[PDB]
Amino acid sequence: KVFGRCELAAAMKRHGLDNYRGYSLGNWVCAAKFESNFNTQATNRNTDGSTDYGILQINSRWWCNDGRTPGSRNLCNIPCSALLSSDITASVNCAKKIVSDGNGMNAWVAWRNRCKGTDVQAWIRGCRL
Protein backbone atom coordinates (compact mmCIF):
# COMPACT_ATOMS: atom_id res chain seq x y z
CA LYS A 1 0.00 0.00 0.00
CA VAL A 2 1.17 3.51 -0.79
CA PHE A 3 -0.08 5.78 1.97
CA GLY A 4 -1.04 9.36 1.63
CA ARG A 5 0.78 11.75 3.96
CA CYS A 6 -2.16 12.56 6.26
CA GLU A 7 -3.45 8.98 6.06
CA LEU A 8 -0.13 7.70 7.39
CA ALA A 9 0.04 10.41 10.05
CA ALA A 10 -3.37 9.31 11.30
CA ALA A 11 -2.38 5.63 11.32
CA MET A 12 0.81 6.34 13.17
CA LYS A 13 -1.10 8.40 15.76
CA ARG A 14 -3.62 5.60 16.28
CA HIS A 15 -0.70 3.23 16.94
CA GLY A 16 0.88 5.50 19.58
CA LEU A 17 3.85 7.02 17.77
CA ASP A 18 3.02 10.70 18.41
CA ASN A 19 5.61 11.78 20.98
CA TYR A 20 6.86 8.20 21.45
CA ARG A 21 10.21 8.58 23.26
CA GLY A 22 9.81 12.32 22.69
CA TYR A 23 9.59 12.21 18.89
CA SER A 24 6.68 14.22 17.53
CA LEU A 25 4.53 12.72 14.80
CA GLY A 26 6.14 14.78 12.05
CA ASN A 27 9.46 13.05 12.68
CA TRP A 28 7.93 9.67 11.98
CA VAL A 29 6.15 10.82 8.83
CA CYS A 30 9.31 12.49 7.55
CA ALA A 31 11.32 9.31 8.21
CA ALA A 32 8.79 7.19 6.35
CA LYS A 33 8.74 9.59 3.41
CA PHE A 34 12.44 9.40 2.83
CA GLU A 35 12.92 5.73 3.77
CA SER A 36 10.12 4.24 1.67
CA ASN A 37 8.19 7.03 -0.07
CA PHE A 38 5.26 5.85 2.06
CA ASN A 39 5.22 2.42 0.34
CA THR A 40 4.71 -0.52 2.66
CA GLN A 41 6.23 -2.90 0.08
CA ALA A 42 9.61 -1.18 -0.19
CA THR A 43 12.69 -3.35 0.08
CA ASN A 44 16.35 -2.43 -0.32
CA ARG A 45 19.41 -4.69 -0.12
CA ASN A 46 22.49 -3.44 1.75
CA THR A 47 26.16 -4.06 1.06
CA ASP A 48 26.46 -6.31 4.10
CA GLY A 49 23.86 -8.72 2.65
CA SER A 50 21.05 -7.60 4.91
CA THR A 51 17.84 -6.10 3.53
CA ASP A 52 15.63 -3.26 4.76
CA TYR A 53 11.87 -3.83 4.78
CA GLY A 54 8.72 -1.76 4.71
CA ILE A 55 7.53 1.69 5.45
CA LEU A 56 10.36 2.33 7.96
CA GLN A 57 13.02 0.20 6.25
CA ILE A 58 13.71 -2.12 9.15
CA ASN A 59 16.88 -4.17 8.78
CA SER A 60 17.19 -7.94 8.71
CA ARG A 61 20.59 -8.14 10.48
CA TRP A 62 19.11 -7.02 13.81
CA TRP A 63 15.35 -6.80 13.79
CA CYS A 64 13.53 -9.32 11.62
CA ASN A 65 14.21 -12.70 10.05
CA ASP A 66 14.30 -12.99 6.27
CA GLY A 67 15.98 -16.39 6.09
CA ARG A 68 18.99 -15.11 4.17
CA THR A 69 20.90 -12.89 6.59
CA PRO A 70 23.35 -15.10 8.52
CA GLY A 71 23.57 -14.24 12.22
CA SER A 72 20.34 -12.29 12.22
CA ARG A 73 19.32 -11.49 15.77
CA ASN A 74 15.58 -11.10 14.99
CA LEU A 75 15.00 -8.77 17.96
CA CYS A 76 11.42 -7.96 16.91
CA ASN A 77 10.64 -11.70 16.64
CA ILE A 78 8.94 -11.46 13.26
CA PRO A 79 9.47 -12.53 9.68
CA CYS A 80 10.58 -9.52 7.67
CA SER A 81 7.71 -10.15 5.24
CA ALA A 82 5.29 -9.08 8.01
CA LEU A 83 6.76 -5.63 7.73
CA LEU A 84 5.48 -5.29 4.14
CA SER A 85 1.76 -5.49 5.11
CA SER A 86 -0.79 -2.77 4.33
CA ASP A 87 -1.44 -2.88 8.11
CA ILE A 88 1.45 -1.00 9.73
CA THR A 89 1.07 -2.52 13.19
CA ALA A 90 4.10 -4.84 12.98
CA SER A 91 6.29 -2.07 11.61
CA VAL A 92 5.21 0.32 14.31
CA ASN A 93 5.73 -2.20 17.12
CA CYS A 94 9.21 -3.00 15.85
CA ALA A 95 10.07 0.68 15.34
CA LYS A 96 9.18 1.32 19.00
CA LYS A 97 11.87 -1.21 19.99
CA ILE A 98 14.42 0.31 17.62
CA VAL A 99 13.94 3.88 18.87
CA SER A 100 14.29 2.67 22.44
CA ASP A 101 17.71 1.05 21.73
CA GLY A 102 19.84 4.04 22.79
CA ASN A 103 20.38 6.15 19.65
CA GLY A 104 16.79 7.32 19.24
CA MET A 105 15.78 8.09 15.70
CA ASN A 106 19.42 8.32 14.59
CA ALA A 107 18.96 4.60 13.85
CA TRP A 108 17.31 5.78 10.61
CA VAL A 109 19.95 7.27 8.37
CA ALA A 110 17.39 9.15 6.26
CA TRP A 111 15.95 10.71 9.42
CA ARG A 112 19.35 11.91 10.56
CA ASN A 113 20.27 13.31 7.16
CA ARG A 114 16.95 14.69 5.97
CA CYS A 115 14.62 15.25 8.87
CA LYS A 116 16.65 15.97 11.98
CA GLY A 117 16.79 19.71 12.71
CA THR A 118 14.20 20.60 10.08
CA ASP A 119 10.63 21.86 10.48
CA VAL A 120 9.13 18.40 10.78
CA GLN A 121 5.71 19.82 11.75
CA ALA A 122 5.31 20.58 8.04
CA TRP A 123 4.75 16.87 7.45
CA ILE A 124 1.47 16.92 9.37
CA ARG A 125 0.26 20.34 8.26
CA GLY A 126 -3.28 20.35 7.02
CA CYS A 127 -4.09 16.90 8.34
CA ARG A 128 -7.21 16.14 10.35
CA LEU A 129 -5.66 14.46 13.39
* 48 catalytic residue (yes or no): no
Q: Which of residues 17-36 bind Mn ion (CB under 5 A)?
A: 35
Q: Which DSSP string do the residues of 33-87 spell out, in sequence order? A: HHHHTTBTT-EEE-TTS-EEETTTTEETTTT-B-SSSTT---TT-SBGGGGGSSS
Candidates 50, 45, 44, 48; CA nearest to 64 is 50
Could you give the strand order of the β-sheet that contains 51-53, starting from the edge strand earlier in sequence? Answer: 43-45, 51-53, 58-59
- Write down the least CB distance from residue 128 to Mn ion, Å: 29
Q: Is 66 in the site for Mn ion (CB under 5 A)?
A: no
Q: 102 or 126: whose CB is closer to Cl ion?
A: 102
Q: Is 52 in the site for Mn ion (CB under 5 A)?
A: yes
Pick what 60 binds: Cl ion, Mn ion, none; C-beta below 5 to 8 Å, kind-dependent: none
Neighbouring C-beta atoms of residue 57, cutoff 10 Å: 23
Q: 44 or 121: whose CB is closer to Cl ion?
A: 121
- Write down the least CB distance from residue 59 to Mn ion, Å: 6
* 7 catalytic residue (yes or no): no
Q: Which of residues 95-114 bind Cl ion (CB under 5 A)?
A: 104
Residues of this chain that interact with Mn ion (CB under 5 A) are 35, 52, 57
Instruction: Give the residue numbers annotated as catalytic, written as ranges.
Output: 35, 52
